[PDB]
Amino acid sequence: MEMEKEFEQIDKSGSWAAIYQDIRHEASDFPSRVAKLPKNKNRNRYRDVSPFDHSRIKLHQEDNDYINASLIKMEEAQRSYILTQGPLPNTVGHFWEMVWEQKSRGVVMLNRVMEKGSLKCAQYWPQKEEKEMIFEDTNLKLTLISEDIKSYYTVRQLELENLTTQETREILHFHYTTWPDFGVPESPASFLNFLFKVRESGSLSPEHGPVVVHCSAGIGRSGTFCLADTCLLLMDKRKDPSSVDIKKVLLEMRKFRMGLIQTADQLRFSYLAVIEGAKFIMGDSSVQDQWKELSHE
């Protein structure tokens, strides 16, 4: 069923809250035993958001290999993502160790450091060229190289140095600075313009480790980003926008991490993003320039 027609049917009937609860009801449930070990309590931001044991990312150290992060492997789309929580004051070292060990090129951040007058994650990257960060626990140095600021989003070139070997890599930081907590982005066009900037960087390409995507919990906003990327990619491969069921893609993604898409509005936006983005995948290249203009970046 063409999702555009499923969309208008759900919209006119106002059954978004009902569709969403069906997804919640059928969603996978797997053990999270390592997350809930007492030694890992200060490594989790929320008590009710845990990585499954089968899909969790492991840190390469004998001490404690635990981080709140999950590998989402989409077999048909041939894309991988790591979804993680906003780093805590005591996990900033672990976060950059994961980025290093997994060979990621890109970090995608969908939240602000402060929202609704509370702290949603640590200031985990440097704000000035000449004030580099050193993570003593994981033996890494991080330096801001350059910054490109636009209306709603900012791209940063960072240099990550393994102090043990003196190897260095360029990491790209893609920061979306407009997405309300437990809410959907402003226009659909604006979100999509951000999505294509990440793609054009090569951060999502198979010659690199998986991209690291996060917000506060790493399930709501983060869920919306990788659901829309994967659905549009599946449209390109078989060329049948019709042969794409967004609900079934979501349930597949929820076998790897719990609670992806947190509200019935996030589910609705996801539909809007994919329907609007499909007006490109299917050969209207101009629409890209239109999104950029409509986004007023």
Query: Footprint of ligand W1D on this chain (CB under 6 A)?
Result: 74-77, 243-245, 248-249, 252
- Asked if 77 and 234 touch (Cβ cutoff 8 Å), the reply is yes
216 assigned to a ligand binding site: yes
Cα 273 versus chain centre, distance = 15
Query: Which residue's structure tokens are 């390469």?
Result: 60
Catalytically active residues are: 215
86 assigned to a ligand binding site: no
The residue among 6 and 159 lying less far from ligand W1D, judged by its C-beta, is 6
Nearest to 83 by CA among 237, 221, 188: 221
The residue among 60 and 237 lying less far from ligand W1D, judged by its C-beta, is 237
In DSSP terms, 157 is beta-bridged to: 146, 172
219 assigned to a ligand binding site: yes
The terminus-to-terminus CA distance of the chain in angstroms comes to 35
**CA 121 – CA 31 distance, rounded (Å):** 26
53 assigned to a ligand binding site: no
Neighbours of 213 (CB within 10 A): 26
The residue among 1 and 118 lying less far from ligand W1D, judged by its C-beta, is 1
166 assigned to a ligand binding site: no
Q: How many helices (H) does the chain have, and how many strands (E)?
A: 8, 11
What's the min distance (Å) between Cβ of 127 and ligand W1D?
A: 38
In DSSP terms, 169 is beta-bridged to: 160
The residue among 49 and 77 lying less far from ligand W1D, judged by its C-beta, is 77
Nearest to 43 by CA among 97, 90, 98, 100: 90
Q: Which residues define the annotated binding site?
A: 181, 215-221, 262
Q: Which residues define the annotated binding site for substrate?
A: 181, 215-221, 262
